[PDB]
Amino acid sequence: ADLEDNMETLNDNLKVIEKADNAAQVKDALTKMRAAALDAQKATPPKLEDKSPDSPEMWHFRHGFDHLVGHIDDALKLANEGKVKEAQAAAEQLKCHCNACHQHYR
Amino acid sequence: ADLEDNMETLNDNLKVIEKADNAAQVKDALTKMRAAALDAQKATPPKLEDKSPDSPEMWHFRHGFDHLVGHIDDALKLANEGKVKEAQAAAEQLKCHCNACHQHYR
Numbered sequence: 001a002d003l004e005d006n007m008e009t010l011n012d013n014l015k016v017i018e019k020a021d022n023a024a025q026v027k028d029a030l031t032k033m034r035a036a037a038l039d040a041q042k043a044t045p046p047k048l049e050d051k052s053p054d055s056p057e058m059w060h061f062r063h064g065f066d067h068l069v070g071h072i073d074d075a076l077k078l079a080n081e082g083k084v085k086e087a088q089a090a091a092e093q094l095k096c097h098c099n100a101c102h103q104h105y106r
Numbered sequence: 107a108d109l110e111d112n113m114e115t116l117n118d119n120l121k122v123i124e125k126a127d128n129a130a131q132v133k134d135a136l137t138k139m140r141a142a143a144l145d146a147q148k149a150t151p152p153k154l155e156d157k158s159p160d161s162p163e164m165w166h167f168r169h170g171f172d173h174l175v176g177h178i179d180d181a182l183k184l185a186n187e188g189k190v191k192e193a194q195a196a197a198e199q200l201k202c203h204c205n206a207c208h209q210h211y212r
């Protein structure tokens with residue numbers, strides 16, 4: 001998708017996790033965010049369009065998504081083992097990282 | 107120390123990093139924060155007296171600290187590399203993580 005869509009596919013699924021009751025809706029939400037995060041990584045946001053392709057602020061921007069995928073992978077581990085309450089909490093650690101990338105590049 | 111002076115140790119050094127002038131000063135404050143958070147990790151918050159230390163709550167409280175120390179370590183790396191601007195930037199990103207644990211356990 002485009003960055004704007006991935007962000008929405010990221011946004012809704014965070015709520016799916018928290019209003020999921022079983023580990024199996026948790027796991028499929030995360031699978032989706034992972035793909036949506038890795039797709040948004042390819043993008044070049046508004047307030048860096050008029051800037052380099054090997055920008056340092058551009059590699060920092062793409063490393064935001066690697067860090068997010070890492071958290072997503074971790075919560076999947078908590079999920080796949082059926083540790084349901086743990087994996088919803090792990091997912092909630094994404095929030096700060098969502099916000100931090102906004103504050104700089106949104 | 108007790109958890110209240112640990113959180114004070116994290117509280118003051120955040121402003122110490124806010125004021126700081128060179129990489130040495132930022133590193134020393136991040137060093138104290140790391141030890142103040144790893145020690146506070148072993149403590150039990152008043153909101154959690156009547157849990158058992160293997161409860162989800164006390165796991166989420168410990169994990170909360172594991173995430174902070176990882177990001178304190180990221181900020182230590184930037185500071186050792188002489189990037190005082192970014193290490194400071196990475197430190198006040200810590201604050202959302204503090205609040206995220208404060209909104210359950212403070």
Ligand code: HEC
Nearest residue numbers: 004007010011045046061064065068094097098101105106
């Ligand atoms: C960078 C590494 C980011 C991370 C991690 C997250 N987001 Fe984001 N987000 C980013 C940008 C640059 C933008 C603005 C894009 C634009 O051109 O407008 C956004 C935007 C959003 C939005 C609004 C979508 C819109 O069209 O304005 C939402 C709802 C959103 N982001 C949610 C969101 C969540 C929940 C995240 C973490 C789980 C998250 N984003 C991470 C850059 C980055």
Ligand code: HEC
Nearest residue numbers: 110113114116117151167170171174200203204207211212
């Ligand atoms: C859990 C995973 C926590 C993280 C991460 C941080 N804090 Fe903390 N904080 C936590 C608890 C359980 C409490 C209650 C202390 C009490 O006994 O009531 C607090 C509170 C504080 C305080 C108040 C100290 C006081 O004497 O009342 C401060 C000043 C504070 N926290 C600072 C702080 C900072 C700056 C943090 C990250 C950078 C941080 N805390 C993380 C639990 C957790």
Ligand SMILES: [Co+2]
Nearest residue numbers: 067071097173
């Ligand atoms: Co993190």
